[PDB]
Subunit: 78 residues, 6 copies
């Protein structure tokens, strides 16, 4: 299944409205890491939005998590 | 600040105990993407755990999110 | 089951105290979608808080996720 | 139609492979509430993924959260 | 504030019904750390549910996160 | 001592740079509950990051969640 940029519903506070855009992993490799993007640059990624939206913050990168499990001692099991 | 592998507290169900290990981003580039790891391979990453823990599941990769905001219309503001 | 409101623990930064309130689905259907609520309106929903808490932001909407699973080929199972 | 469905990347454990699909709010209204979807049901919805994928679980419904703040004294 | 128990909405997979219950901190201090609870023990905590719900897993422990912020150099601000 | 502190990667908005620090459960007990930490306070705790970083917020306390399941009828 594939490469759809997803636009989430908007939410707002006392002064702004906000939204998240989800990129395919492939495309997020194109996002600059050292600076916020102009409209010119996020439009080159394929992001299409109406007037006046600003890339104001980099999202908190999520940790790379490894998952491990092991049998409990037998008398601890149910 | 730097490269500490983090071991979280354990939790359990009726049969197993579990834990998460957080890797520095650098090191997660070394984790295989096509298969689960033997103890030999996760020990080569620097993961140190006691006896019998098994890498049983790949964690759900988190979406790459872009954040945008724009001024509300003036009369919608507080 | 039941239908109580859950009040989280307070936390703070340099300027504000913060808390989340969790509504049961039937009451969350009476929350305005187009504006922030005043103290008279969120008290009418039944939020019991002391003086001065401000409804300042709409929580970002969570996606509606479908989960899919399928068996691995035998030779990829462990 | 024109609907943005987000397809997450796959992850797997010792026996299964898994994927999450993000639906727009409107198409969400059309998902059965009482039962899981058959392969013809999610293909009629517009989910375009390989055959064999099984709708196996209803996602955890996140609570409806109200956000409050109060200025500290100064 | 207050101190009610919040009961989430039920969801299901091919075999089970599932729900989360959220405890206020004072009551969550009386939850066993070393074993799963029986129906007599979680009812004694005040969880009111119908017959047959099983406490089957301990929720994974969340890290204790400190948040740090510092001003960007002027020439990196926007 | 020997304590695993996890340092998240940094992110920034238009005016600030941000970082999260993950503490082991035991060192967590030693964080002030009533006020934010000064730079000497978090340096005495073992947090080893550049000067200038300010402890600005107490993290959202996640609820204490009990997990229940019930078999469906068959």
């Amino acid at each position: 299944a594939h490469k759809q940029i997803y636009y989430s519903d908007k939410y707002f506070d006392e002064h702004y409205e906000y939204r998240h855009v989800m990129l395919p992993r492939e495309l997020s490799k194109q996002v600059p890491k050292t600076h916020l993007m102009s409209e010119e640059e996020w439009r080159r990624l394929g992001v299409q939005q109406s007037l006046g939206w600003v890339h104001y913050m980099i999202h908190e990168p999520e940790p790379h998590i490894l998952l491990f499990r092991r049998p409990l001692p037998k008398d601890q099991q149910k």
